[PDB]
C-alpha cells in the first residue's frame, strides 16, 4: 500500500524512477540498476494510456504478487512508483523461464532439476489457491522462473481468479477446479524432461485440443532412466478423468515431492553452467 520505495532484502530505500538506470528490454518490461545499491531489476512500465485489457491483467497480477510476500517460490515485488503518465512495477530479476531453458539446452532437462522445480511450483499453486482462494489457470513452462541463485518460482499471473496446448480435458470438454492446473503442470513436466512437447506435428489449435481427448496421455517415456517416482508423478497429474486426479494435497504428500523436498540439490551449479554454454 506504499510506492516510491524499494524493499529488497529486507531492506527499505527511498526511491524514484530516476534513482534506477535503464538497461534494455526483456506491458514493457525493463531490466534495470538501482544505482543506490547496485541491485540489478525488472520493472514493468504500465503506461496510463496503454490497453485496458493489458493494463487489468497487470493490474491483477501485481494485487496478487502484492499478497504472496510470505511465499518463497512466487516472484516477488520490491515496490512501485506512480507518476503522472506511468505506474513502474519493480520484480525481482530471474534468468530465465524453463521454456527459454528448454530452448537454449536443446535437450532434455535432468530429472534432479525437474524435482527441485516440482517442489517449487506445486507449492506456489497450493499456497495461491489455500491463502488466496486463486487459481492460475495458466500454468506452462514459459510461467516457470530460474535464477543464478538456484531459486526457481511461478511468475505473473494475469489470469488468476489459458494456453491451448496445456489446457487439461475438462477444459475442452467441461462436464458442467485447481486439478486442471495439475494437467498443465503434468505436460509441462513431460515436455521438459523429454524436450519435446506431447502433442507432436499439431499445426492448429484445435489439433491439439483434439489431441489431448482421443489420446492417452502423454505419460514418461521408461527407457531414459526416470525414477519410478517420477514416473508416478507425471502419470497421476495426467489422469485424463478430473474427478480422480489428485488435488494439491495430496500430491504434496508423493514421493517424488518428499524425495526433492530434503535432497540437495545444486541447481545454481547446473544452472550456470547451461547458460555458459550459450
Ligand atoms: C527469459 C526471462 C528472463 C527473466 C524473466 C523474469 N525475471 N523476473 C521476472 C518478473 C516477472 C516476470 C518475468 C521475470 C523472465 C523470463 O522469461
Known amino acids: 500500500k506504499q510506492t516510491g520505495y524499494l524493499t529488497i532484502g529486507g531492506q527499505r530505500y527511498q526511491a524514484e524512477i530516476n534513482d534506477l538506470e535503464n538497461l534494455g528490454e526483456m506491458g514493457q518490461v525493463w531490466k534495470m540498476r538501482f544505482r543506490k545499491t547496485g541491485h540489478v ?4 512500465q504500465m503506461r496510463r494510456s496503454g490497453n485496458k485489457e493489458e493494463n487489468k491483467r497487470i493490474l491483477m497480477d501485481l494485487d496478487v504478487v502484492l499478497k504472496s510476500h510470505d511465499c518463497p517460490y512466487i516472484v516477488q ?3 512501485t512508483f506512480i507518476t503522472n503518465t506511468d505506474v513502474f512495477i519493480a520484480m525481482e530479476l530471474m534468468g530465465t523461464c524453463a521454456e527459454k531453458l528448454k530452448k537454449r539446452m536443446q535437450g532434455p532437462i535432468p530429472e534432479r532439476i525437474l524435482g527441485k522445480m516440482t517442489v517449487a511450483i506445486v507449492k506456489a499453486l497450493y499456497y495461491l489457491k489455500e491463502k488466496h482462494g486463486v487459481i492460475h489457470r495458466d500454468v ?3 510461467n516457470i522462473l530460474l535464477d543464478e541463485r ?14 491451448a496446448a496445456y489446457m487439461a480435458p475438462e477444459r475442452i470438454d467441461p462436464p458442467d477446479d ?3 492446473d495439475v494437467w498443465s503442470l503434468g505436460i509441462s513436466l513431460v515436455e521438459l524432461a523429454t524436450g ?5 506435428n499439431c499445426k492448429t489449435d484445435f489439433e491439439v485440443l483434439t489431441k489431448v481427448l482421443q489420446e492417452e496421455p502423454p505419460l514418461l517415456p521408461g527407457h531414459m532412466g526416470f525414477s519410478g517416482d517420477f514416473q508416478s508423478f507425471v502419470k497421476d497429474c495426467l489422469t485424463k478423468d478430473h474427478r480422480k486426479r489428485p488435488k494439491y494435497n495430496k500430491l504434496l504428500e508423493h514421493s517424488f515431492i518428499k524425495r526433492y523436498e530434503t535432497l540437495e540439490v545444486d541447481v545454481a551449479s547446473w544452472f550456470k553452467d547451461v547458460m555458459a554454454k550459450t
Open 41 to 44: 531489476i525488472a520493472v514493468k
Open 77 to 79: 515485488c520490491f515496490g
Open 140 to 142: 506452462k513452462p514459459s
Open 150 to 163: 538456484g531459486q526457481i518460482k511461478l511468475c505473473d499471473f494475469g489470469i488468476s481468479g489459458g494456453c
Open 178 to 180: 485447481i486439478r486442471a
Open 196 to 200: 519435446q512437447f506431447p502433442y507432436k
